[PDB]
Structure 1
Amino acid sequence: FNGLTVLPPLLTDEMIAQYTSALLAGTITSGWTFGAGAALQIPFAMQM
């Protein structure tokens, strides 16, 4: 009340959660190929 204000962040928590889920799903489905370019599917045991 003395001129002190708190500004809201640009990315809401739901958006950050969506980013995290996209990263994790890409990891478990394509391995490391989605970072270099287009995602390429591979069975999980073969990736391990």
Structure 2
Amino acid sequence: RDLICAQKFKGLTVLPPLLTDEMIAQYTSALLAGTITSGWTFGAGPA
């Protein structure tokens, strides 16, 4: 077997994160859109 499955049989597990890669990508896209279309006004108040 691989290394990930060999550790589960010894009690060692890996819990998945709450925010997936898609949500982080959407957050980064929103930040880029706010920085390009508004600049720094979206960090203080309305865009």
Q: Does TM, normalized by the shorter one, top 0.5?
A: yes
Higher CA-based Rg: 2
TM superposition shift of 1:11: 0.4
> Which one has more relative contact order, counting CA pairs under 8 Å at least 6 apart?
1
Identity of counterpart residues, as a percentage?
A: 95
User: How large is the Cα RMSD of the aligned pairs?
Assistant: 0.5
Number of aligned pairs?
Answer: 39
Runs of 4+ residues deviating >6 angstroms: none
Normalised by the size of structure 2, how large is the TM-score? Answer: 0.79
Runs of 5+ in structure 2 lacking a partner? 1-8
The answer to whether the aligner puts 1:7 opposite 2:46 as a matched pair is: no
Normalised by the size of structure 1, how large is the TM-score? Answer: 0.78
